[PDB]
Each structure stands twice: as C-alpha cells, then as structure tokens.
Amino acid sequence: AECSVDIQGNDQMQFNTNAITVDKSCKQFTVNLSHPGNLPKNVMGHNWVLSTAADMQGVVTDGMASGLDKDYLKPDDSRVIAHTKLIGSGEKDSVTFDVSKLKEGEQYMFFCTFPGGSALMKGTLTLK
Amino acid sequence: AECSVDIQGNDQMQFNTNAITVDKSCKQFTVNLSHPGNLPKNVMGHNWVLSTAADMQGVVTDGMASGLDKDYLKPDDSRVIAHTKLIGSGEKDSVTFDVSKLKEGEQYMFFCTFPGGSALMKGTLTLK
Numbered sequence: 667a668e669c670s671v672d673i674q675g676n677d678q679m680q681f682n683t684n685a686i687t688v689d690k691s692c693k694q695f696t697v698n699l700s701h702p703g704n705l706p707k708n709v710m711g712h713n714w715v716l717s718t719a720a721d722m723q724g725v726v727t728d729g730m731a732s733g734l735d736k737d738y739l740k741p742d743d744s745r746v747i748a749h750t751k752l753i754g755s756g757e758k759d760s761v762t763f764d765v766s767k768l769k770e771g772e773q774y775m776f777f778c779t780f781p782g783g784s785a786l787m788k789g790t791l792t793l794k
Numbered sequence: 795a796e797c798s799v800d801i802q803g804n805d806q807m808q809f810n811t812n813a814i815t816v817d818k819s820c821k822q823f824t825v826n827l828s829h830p831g832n833l834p835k836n837v838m839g840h841n842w843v844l845s846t847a848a849d850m851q852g853v854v855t856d857g858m859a860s861g862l863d864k865d866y867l868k869p870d871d872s873r874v875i876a877h878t879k880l881i882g883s884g885e886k887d888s889v890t891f892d893v894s895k896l897k898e899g900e901q902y903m904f905f906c907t908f909p910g911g912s913a914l915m916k917g918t919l920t921l922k
C-alpha cells in the first residue's frame with residue numbers, strides 16, 4: 667500500500683518511524699496514526715503535524731501556547747500543511763492530503779506539538 | 795511518623811498527595827520520593843522541589859531551561875528551599891531539610907520541574 671503509511675506514537679514519546687517518503691506519483695497521501703500504550707491524551711497526547719522544516723519550530727511554539735482544547739495547534743496556522751487530531755491511548759486518526767501541496771527538493775518535518783521542552787517527537791518527510 | 799512524608803509520582807504525572815503539612819515542632823523534615831510505573835527518567839522524570847508560591851514559576855522556567863543533565867534545576871537556584879534528585883521508574887530519593895527554613899503564614903509549593911504535559915505537577919506545603 668503506497669500512498670499511505672501507518673504510524674504509531676507510544677507512551678515513550680516515540681513515533682515508530684522517523685522518515686516518511688511520499689511517492690511523487692500519488693495524487694493523495696494518507697497518514698494513519700494510532701496510539702498503543704496506556705496513557706491518556708492529556709498526559710501523552712500525540713498528533714501528526716506536517717510543515718516545512720523551516721516552519722516546524724514556529725508551529726510548535728504557537729501550538730503549545732494554544733492549549734489542549736486546540737489540540738495544541740494554532741487555529742488556522744497556515745504553516746500546517748496537514749495534521750491529525752490529537753489522540754490518547756487506544757485512539758486512532760487519519761489524514762489525507764494532496765501531494766500537489768508538496769514541492770520537490772524541500773525539507774518537510776512531521777512532529778507532535780504536545781508540550782515537552784527540547785524535543786522532539788519528530789521525523790522527516792520527502793518526495794520521491 | 796511525623797516529620798516525614800512518603801510521596802509518589804507515577805506514569806500519569808500525578809503526585810499521590812497535593813497538600814503537605816509540616817509540624818511546627820519538627821527540627822527537620824524528610825520527603826521520601828518514589829516512582830512506581832514503568833517509564834524511564836528521560837520520559838517521565840519526577841523530582842520533588844520546594845519554594846515559595848511566588849518563586850515556583852521562575853524556578854520551573856529556569857529549571858526546564860537547564861536540561862536533563864541538571865535534573866532540570868538551575869545550578870544554585872537560591873529560590874529552591876529543598877529538592878530531591880530527578881528519578882525514573884523504580885528509583886527512589888529522599889531529602890531532609892531544616893524546618894527553620896520555613897516561615898509561618900507563607901504559601902509554599904512543591905512540584906516536579908520536568909518539562910510537562912497539560913499543566914504542572916503541583917502541590918502545597920504549610921507550617922502548622
């Protein structure tokens with residue numbers, strides 16, 4: 667199954683992968699985010715958020731400053747290329763987005779925007 | 795056993811108590827901190843740290859800005875009345891301090907200074 671990827675965030679602040687490759691010839695791409703482990707959303711929440719490498723920092727800072735009610739994202743943060751809901755243990759969220767929103771030779775980062783000082787629940791994303 | 799208290803911080807960011815009362819007639823007071831649950835120091839670290847209510851904020855901010863090597867405390871933070879080591883799952887640390895360092899009618903706060911989730915692992919402590 668190209669044009670999708672299953673990804674997990676555990677009670678350890680770990681994504682089960684840190685490099686996503688998106689196939690140049692997908693019209694759309696889907697991220698299937700789950701949470702094993704036993705910790706609730708308010709303690710060990712994870713979302714999967716996509717931005718350019720450059721924007722990641724800003725998106726995170728403004729995101730944490732948005733609070734739990736906003737899934738730790740700034741409302742209408744135009745830097746956020748795509749994102750899932752914030753999930754807790756045993757929950758499950760998907761996000762599909764147009765691959766046309768991605769550009770060749772750019773660094774993208776995926777990450778979780780839930781609080782933790784110097785991080786980071788992060789990973790790279792890239793076309794191919 | 796007055797003049798001491800056993801206190802736990804779990805994989806949930808929860809101290810097992812949030813109000814400590816120090817007996818006016820103890821010469822010294824002892825806090826026995828332990829960590830049930832399974833998560834390592836670098837994920838779910840807990841220390842027990844005591845300051846005035848006033849100082850708590852600055853101590854926490856400068857503490858998180860100190861990093862894991864410094865047990866998330868500012869070196870020689872003179873606002874820190876007493877503190878334990880930072881511990882992970884299965885670990886155990888105690889701290890004794892002079893009750894003379896406490897003053898009647900003042901709000902004191904105990905807290906973990908590890909970089910948090912939704913809000914802070916707080917509690918109160920009072921002379922009586």
Ligand SMILES: c1cn(CCCCCCn2ccnc2)cn1
Binds near residue numbers: 778782838911
């Ligand atoms: C993934 C992990 N996180 C942070 C999980 C919080 C861990 C809290 C540990 N802690 C906080 C205060 N004392 C101990 C955000 N997204």
Ligand SMILES: [Zn+2]
Binds near residue numbers: 779
């Ligand atoms: Zn997370």
Ligand SMILES: [Zn+2]
Binds near residue numbers: 803838839908915
């Ligand atoms: Zn802690």
